[PDB]
A paper describes a structure:
Synaptic complexes of α-amino-3-hydroxy-5-methyl-4-isoxazolepropionic acid ([name]) receptors (AMPARs) with auxiliary subunits mediate most excitatory neurotransmission and can be targeted to treat neuropsychiatric and neurological disorders, including epilepsy. The core of each complex is a Y-shaped tetrameric AMPAR with a three-layer domain organization. Auxiliary subunits are membrane proteins that associate with and regulate AMPAR trafficking, cellular localization, gating kinetics and pharmacology.
We purified protein from these cells, supplemented it with 0.1 mM ZK and subjected to cryo-EM. Data analysis revealed two distinct populations of particles. The second population produced a three-dimensional (3D) reconstruction with densities for four auxiliary subunits around the [name] channel. The map quality was sufficient to unambiguously identify and build models of four [name], two γ5 and two endogenous human [name] subunits. Despite each [name] subunit in [name]–γ5–[name] being covalently linked to γ5, density was observed for only two γ5 subunits, suggesting that similar to [name]–γ5, the other two γ5s were disordered. Comparison of the closed-state ZK-bound structures in the presence and absence of [name] revealed a strong cylindrical density in the selectivity filter of the [name]–γ5–[name] pore, which was not present in [name]–γ5. We subjected the protein that was used in cryo-EM experiments to mass spectrometry (MS) analysis and identified the presence of polyamine SPD.
Author numbering:
A (entry chain D): 206 to 254
B (entry chain B): 10 to 498
C (entry chain A): 59 to 205
Write the structure that this text describes.
Amino acid sequence: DQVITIGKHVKGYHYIIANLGFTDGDLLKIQFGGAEVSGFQIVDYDDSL
Amino acid sequence: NSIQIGGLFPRGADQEYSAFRVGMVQFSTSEFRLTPHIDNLEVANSFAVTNAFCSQFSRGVYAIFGFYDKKSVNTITSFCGTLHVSFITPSFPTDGTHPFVIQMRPDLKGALLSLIEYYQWDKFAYLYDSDRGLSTLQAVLDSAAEKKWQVTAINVGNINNDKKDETYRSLFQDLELKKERRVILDCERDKVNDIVDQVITIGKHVKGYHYIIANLGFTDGDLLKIQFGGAEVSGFQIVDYDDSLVSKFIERWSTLEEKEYPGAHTATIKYTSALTYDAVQVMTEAFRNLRKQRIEISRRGNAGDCLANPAVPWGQGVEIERALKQVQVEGLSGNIKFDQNGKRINYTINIMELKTNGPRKIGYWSEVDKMVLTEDDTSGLEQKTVVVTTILESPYVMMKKNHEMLEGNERYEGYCVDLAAEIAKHCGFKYKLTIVGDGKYGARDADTKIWNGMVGELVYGKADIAIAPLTITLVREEVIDFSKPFMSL
Amino acid sequence: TNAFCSQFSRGVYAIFGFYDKKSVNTITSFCGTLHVSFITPSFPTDGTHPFVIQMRPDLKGALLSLIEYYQWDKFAYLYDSDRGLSTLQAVLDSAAEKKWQVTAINVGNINNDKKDETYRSLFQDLELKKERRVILDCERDKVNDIV
Ligand SMILES: O=c1[nH]c2cc(C(F)(F)F)c(N3CCOCC3)cc2n(CP(=O)(O)O)c1=O
């Protein structure tokens, strides 16, 4: 949220959410900005269990 | 002495109805009375406007205070035009000369054209709103020919409430492919809050993208979203809170209830609501000035058949209308002074910006004098123009042949001048040439120890650099720190 | 409004009639509420007003297809604001995409003493920018006055 209000999610600013469960947050805020945000998950939903 | 007035408030107007219900009593002297018959309705539907115009014609009011929209401005001004029933409103500043209809909203259409010339634009995009009319679109296109603009007017007022997210993004992605880093947003309040959110999510509020919220009441929105981005967002207000009547009013306003006046506790008033307070001031100052000249405006059991064939007046006509169009009150908008038509003369639309601190004011637009820049001129913030002290000795800096034609830092030319222009690019600064008085490159005096010439001005205080032929010697290296040499003579 | 209720005081079943842009909102609201079908050879309304039967079909698309056949980007779209701005709103939205440079002048509200001054101020203020591709957009009475 404080990246967005000061406008640091435009094209260029790469991020790495180093937290094990990357999609557990509110990613539909910087998804459409233009900043490549990588991440880490363990519970990959495209699987059997 | 208890004059019956109508008043057609919309179905979704709460704060607007508040400042009517507020301004009714805290303005009224108990002599007169302003008995309403307020009818709420969906004003985009000329059917219900027609019923409620004749319902308040059946009861025989002397003025109606309604809000029209695009799809009903041709209904209100037509019925009021023929049946002579006076009408006062803060809605659209009507295209043309409709009689008996008092516009209290100021005419924005001139203030937008003045502002752009101050920023000197040519390359807008003019996202506008279809439902709020197009009279401003035919003032920045009709006047785009003369001043060579390249308006890229995109209608955004037809956007569905499910395809909102997709279309506004595809809107600016289209404007990005044309590289339009200037938008002159034109909508009403709730579409400005929906655009500013969709500007942020796609990250178009960084440094560069100027905006102009062309809406009369710039601070009525949610500006603490793009305040800290970096995008200069100008604007327009009429209720300037740094004044007498507003500050008195806002103290009363901020103390009000949550359920007696809905949406009143907030310390900012909507301009639609704000003019409504200034309306009630006009809506009796005429009528009490009317009682100063003894005009009995009274009537009878007026037939509730507006659609009478033939259609006669209500009697007396212009007698009300003369009173309304002479009222010079002072309200919380400025000098409310009308004309023979119903448009406001001599108001004070004041141009704002949006700095990091908050919504700063930078002066005003007002019919007589176009754009007054009454701003803090103490915001200089300069990069002080250093006194480059220089001797005059060719093939270095020499005086050009047109030596009495131009002035300042273009007069001199030579080796030092092209050196100064080249050193200024790297050491980034600004500079203004200065020839020393006596000559005398450098000399410490015999006993008084007063330096001479360019050393005398570099040492003491009246210089910042000495781009000139000074020989690096020992007795000038102590007091002045040289640069590594640019020429080995 | 007078005549519509005079027709409603006879209980008519189809109303033929014309409407300007100053009466479009009165009719399509009345015929939408009081469900009386209204047949009209006037400019079609923007939007989706029910119970009006419009028969001047649509110019809005044909004007956009004719320009593409001539391949323009240098118009001078002189419009008359007495028939709906709905066509101007089309060749400004479609002026974004196809890279056009419309210079839309209101040639509408102009009285008769300035008819030999405003137009002779008008075309010179197109010739000074060298516009050669005017898209005159008026009803017949105003077209012959420009021509
Ligand atoms: O720092 C110094 N730089 C100087 C630079 C020059 C020039 F060549 F013009 F650049 C001259 N000139 C030599 C020829 O006659 C005209 C003046 C004198 C300079 N002097 C006085 P100096 O003691 O005689 O050297 C300085 O002190």
